[PDB]
């Protein structure tokens, strides 16, 4: 999986470790091996969420398989936001989470591509 | 909507509060109202755009319904470039826009997903 | 085409002038004018790729028509993995490419779309 994290949180009100933590809440909540996930965090940005500049946090999920559906997107999307929120002292109303379907078509690794 | 900025301008020639008239020009620009609008800006990057390493900006933004058509986009681009030309005092050539559409399968958003 | 590289390589790490020989490879590689590359480079964040927060990077590229198969994408793949392994001294462990095609509504240019 490929979790990205932008956050206007400057990155000292961003805990220590937070990108190892989401590693692997990410690789239990989508059911995917630890060495298969991937997050990149990009803390003190400028940002409004929901026409708000208060401190907030937007998460890019992509993944093959498993975050293609309602169904499995709300399950995922109930553990991340009870992780996202205490991290980073978040309420709620306060983190966006998109989901984006990948194929193995897409994903460049070794130096080719495996299907 | 979720709009996304990044800049190889640094941070002190991105005029403050830029995130926040965005907002506003992006819920007026795309009929949509501005609880409902998300902006973040990544000021300090390294970037080329048009082969040329001169100050440049790039533009997202995902929505449902409203950036899925030609005709759609074309009357918010020219909204968009009126806009971020003047704030970042780039030419118009200095600016790319891509648009991508979303569901609301895709969002989630209080720990839930919402269809 | 649109390049984005994100690295938890702190700026001063990534070579000098990175995004202007990305700029030029990508045009070779892809076979696209570099008048109409677009690379962006974001250091210094916080990442884990494959479970490992080791130096590692994170390359995105969005292109019409070049980047939509497999055979494609495993061309590209090879040449990106081996200016970007070289360029920022990681392992090929250490990269991970996405590919997204693109279509001309999606891009917003000089005020239009063109299609």
């Known amino acids: 999986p490929?979790?990205?994290?932008?956050?206007?949180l400057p990155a000292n009100r961003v805990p220590?470790?937070?990108?190892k933590?989401?590693?692997?809440?990410?690789?239990s909540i989508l059911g995917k091996p630890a060495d298969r996930?991937?997050?990149?965090?990009?803390?003190?940005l400028?940002?409004?969420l929901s026409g708000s500049t208060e401190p907030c946090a937007q998460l890019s999920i992509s993944s093959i398989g498993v975050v293609g559906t309602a169904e499995?997107?709300?399950?995922?999307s109930a553990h991340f936001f009870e992780f996202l929120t205490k991290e980073l002292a978040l309420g709620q109303d306060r983190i966006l989470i998109r989901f984006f379907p990948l194929e193995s078509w897409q994903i460049g690794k070794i130096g080719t591509v495996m299907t």
Do not use: I, K, Y
Not at 2 to 8: Q, V
Not at 16 to 19: C, F, I, K, S, T
Not at 21 to 27: D, G, H, I, T, V
Not at 72 to 76: A, I, L, P, Q, V
């Open 72 to 76: 499995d997107n709300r399950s995922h």
């Open 21 to 27: 933590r989401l590693c692997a809440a990410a690789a």
């Open 16 to 19: 220590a470790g937070l990108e």
């Open 37 to 44: 996930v991937n997050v990149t965090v990009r803390p003190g």
């Open 2 to 8: 490929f979790l990205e994290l932008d956050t206007n």
């Open 46 to 48: 400028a940002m409004a």
